[PDB]
Amino acid sequence: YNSTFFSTFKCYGVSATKLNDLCFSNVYADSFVVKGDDVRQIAPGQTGVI
Amino acid sequence: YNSTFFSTFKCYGVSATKLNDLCFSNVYADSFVVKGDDVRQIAPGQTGVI
Numbered sequence: 138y139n140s141t142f143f144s145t146f147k148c149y150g151v152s153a154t155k156l157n158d159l160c161f162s163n164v165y166a167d168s169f170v171v172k173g174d175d176v177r178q179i180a181p182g183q184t185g186v187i
Numbered sequence: 188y189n190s191t192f193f194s195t196f197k198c199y200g201v202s203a204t205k206l207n208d209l210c211f212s213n214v215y216a217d218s219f220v221v222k223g224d225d226v227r228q229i230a231p232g233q234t235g236v237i
């Protein structure tokens with residue numbers, strides 16, 4: 138909350154307000170870089186080049 | 188996918204991932220130009236000047 142801010146942050150399968158009350162089993166992080174018009178394509182059930 | 192890119196693309200009545208497996212009956216295309224704050228108004232169940 139002091140330094141880093143996100144333009145989009147959307148989660149599926151769990152509400153955000155409960156993220157501090159849980160514990161997570163098999164955590165993986167995928168990283169890449171896209172353009173601005175492709176950020177909407179990183180979602181379930183989407184079409185496009187990405 | 189080579190030349191033209193869309194900032195918003197949202198469809199209603201059919202999932203996007205099935206658009207290559209179907210055939211369409213009565214296809215019409217409406218064209219116009221708006222400002223940036225009015226693109227959100229082109230949707231079902233919306234209010235505003237547009």
Ligand SMILES: CCCCC/C=C\C/C=C\CCCCCCCC(=O)O
Pocket residue numbers: 184185186191192193196206211214216
């Ligand atoms: C101009 C005539 C078009 C006729 C189309 C007929 C039926 C609709 C089916 C597919 C059109 C979807 C276009 C979306 C292009 C991909 C968007 C993206 O880059 O993610």
Ligand SMILES: CCCCC/C=C\C/C=C\CCCCCCCC(=O)O
Pocket residue numbers: 234235236
């Ligand atoms: C300042 C006092 C407002 C009191 C309003 C009372 C009830 C709410 C009902 C209508 C307010 C909706 C305002 C939206 C303006 C249109 C937005 C647009 O341009 O699309």
Ligand SMILES: *[C@@H]1O[C@H](CO)[C@@H](O)[C@H](O)[C@H]1NC(C)=O
Pocket residue numbers: 139
């Ligand atoms: C938050 O960031 C500022 C900027 O450097 C820093 O001075 C401050 O100590 C930070 N706060 C904490 C709790 O680290």
Ligand SMILES: *[C@@H]1O[C@H](CO)[C@@H](O)[C@H](O)[C@H]1NC(C)=O
Pocket residue numbers: 189
């Ligand atoms: C895609 O666009 C580039 C830019 O002009 C062009 O060189 C290339 O041949 C195009 N690809 C196809 C398959 O048309």
